[PDB]
Structure 1
Amino acid sequence: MRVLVTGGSGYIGSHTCVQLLQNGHDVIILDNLCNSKRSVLPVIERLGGKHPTFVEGDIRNEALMTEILHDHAIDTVIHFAGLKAVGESVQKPLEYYDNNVNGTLRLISAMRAANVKNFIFSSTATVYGDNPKIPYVESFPTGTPQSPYGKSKLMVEQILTDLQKAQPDWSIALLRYFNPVGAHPSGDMGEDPQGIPNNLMPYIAQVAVGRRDSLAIFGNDYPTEDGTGVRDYIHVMDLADGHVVAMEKLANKPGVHIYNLGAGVGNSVLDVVNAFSKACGKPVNYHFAPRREGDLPAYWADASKADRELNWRVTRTLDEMAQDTWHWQSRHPQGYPD
Structure 2
Amino acid sequence: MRVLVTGGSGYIGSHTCVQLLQNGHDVIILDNLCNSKRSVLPVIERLGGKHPTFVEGDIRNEALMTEILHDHAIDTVIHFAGLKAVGESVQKPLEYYDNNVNGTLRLISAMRAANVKNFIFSSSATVYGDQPKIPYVESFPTGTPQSPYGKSKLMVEQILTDLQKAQPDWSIALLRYFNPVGAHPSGDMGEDPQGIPNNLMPYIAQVAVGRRDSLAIFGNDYPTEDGTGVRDYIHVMDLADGHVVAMEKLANKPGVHIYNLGAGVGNSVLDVVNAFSKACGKPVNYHFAPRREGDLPAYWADASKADRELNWRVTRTLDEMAQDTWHWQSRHPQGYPD
Place the TM-score, normalised by the shorter chain, in its bin: over 0.9
Q: In structure 2, what is the Cα distance between the partners aligned to 1:190 and 1:172?
A: 27
CA distance in 2, matches of 1:250, 1:170: 10
Give the structure 1 partner of residue 121 of structure 2. Answer: 121
Deviations 1:274-293 (A, max 9, x none): 00000000100000000101
Report Cα offsets for 1:8-62 as digits up to 9, x if no partner. 0000000000000000000000000000000000000000000000000000000
> For 1:153 and 1:330, how far apart are their aligned partners in 2?
33
> What residue number does 1:155 align with?
155
Secondary structure of residue in 1 paired with 2:135:
coil
Distance in structure 2 (CA, Å) of the matches to 1:205 and 1:196? 12
**In 2: Cα distance, 1:219 partner to 1:133 partner:** 21
Q: Secondary structure at the match of 2:119?
A: strand
In 2: Cα distance, 1:273 partner to 1:190 partner:
19
Question: Distance in 2 between the 1:330 and 1:294 partners?
Answer: 33
Does 2:179 align with 1:179? yes
Runs of 4+ in 1 over 3 A off after TM superposition: none
| Offset at residue 106 of structure 1 (A) | 0.2
Cα deviations by residue, 1:107-127 (Å, 9 ceiling, x for unpaired): 000000000000000000000
- The 5-angstrom pairing of residues 287-326 of structure 1 reads 287-326=287-326
Corresponding residue for residue 51 of structure 1: 51
Cα deviations by residue, 1:206-230 (Å, 9 ceiling, x for unpaired): 0000000000000001010000000
* Cα deviation digits, residues 51-77 of structure 1 (max 9, x gap): 000000000000000000000000000
Give the RMSD, CA atoms, in angstroms: 0.2
- In structure 2, distance between residues paired with 1:293 and 1:81: 26
Q: CA deviation at 1:184?
A: 0.2
Gaps of 5+ in 1: none
Gaps in structure 2 of 5+ consecutive residues: none
**Partner secondary structure for residue 263 of structure 1:** coil
Query: Which residues of 2 match residues 1-338 of structure 1 at below 5 A?
Result: 1-338=1-338
1:256 is paired with a residue whose SS is: strand
- SS of corresponding position for 2:120: strand
The 2-side partners of 1:162 and 1:111 are apart by 15
**Alpha-carbon distance in structure 1 between the residues aligned to 2:189 and 2:101:** 29
Distance (Å, rounded) in 2 between the aligned partners of 1:91 and 1:77: 30
SS in structure 1 at match of 2:299: coil
Q: What do the CA deviations read for 1:187-244 (whole angstroms, capped 9, x no partner)?
A: 0000000000000000000000000000000000101000000000000000000000
| In structure 1, distance between residues paired with 2:319 and 2:96 | 34
Q: In 2, distance between residues paired with 1:283 and 1:204?
A: 11
Q: Percent identity?
A: 99
User: 1:86: how far off?
Assistant: 0.1
Q: CA deviation at 1:4?
A: 0.2
Give 1:145 shift.
0.1
Q: Distance in 2 between matches of 1:296 and 1:97?
A: 24
Question: Residue 224 of structure 1 aligns to a residue in which SS?
Answer: coil
Distance (Å, rounded) in 2 between the aligned partners of 1:186 and 1:138: 34
Please give the per-residue CA displacement for 1:118-169, whole angstroms capped at 9, x wherever unaligned. 0000000000000000000000000000100000000000000000000000
Q: Secondary structure at the match of 1:88?
A: helix
Q: Matches of 1:237 and 1:135 in 2, distance apart?
A: 22
CA deviation after TM superposition for structure 1 residue 294, in Å = 1.5
The alpha-carbon deviation at position 250 of structure 1 amounts to 0.1
Instruction: Provide the secondary structure at the position in 1 that maps to 2:28.
Output: strand
For 1:293 and 1:169, the matched residues in 2 are separated by 42
* Deviation, structure 1 residue 103: 0.0
TM norm structure 2: 1.00
- 1:259 partner SS: strand
**For residues 185 and 153 of structure 2, what CA distance do their matches in structure 1 show?**
30
Report the CA distance between 1:255 and its aligned residue.
0.1
> How many residues in Structure 1 have an aligned counterpart in Structure 2?
338
Please report how far the alpha carbon of residue 3 of structure 1 lies from its aligned counterpart in structure 2 after TM superposition. Answer: 0.1
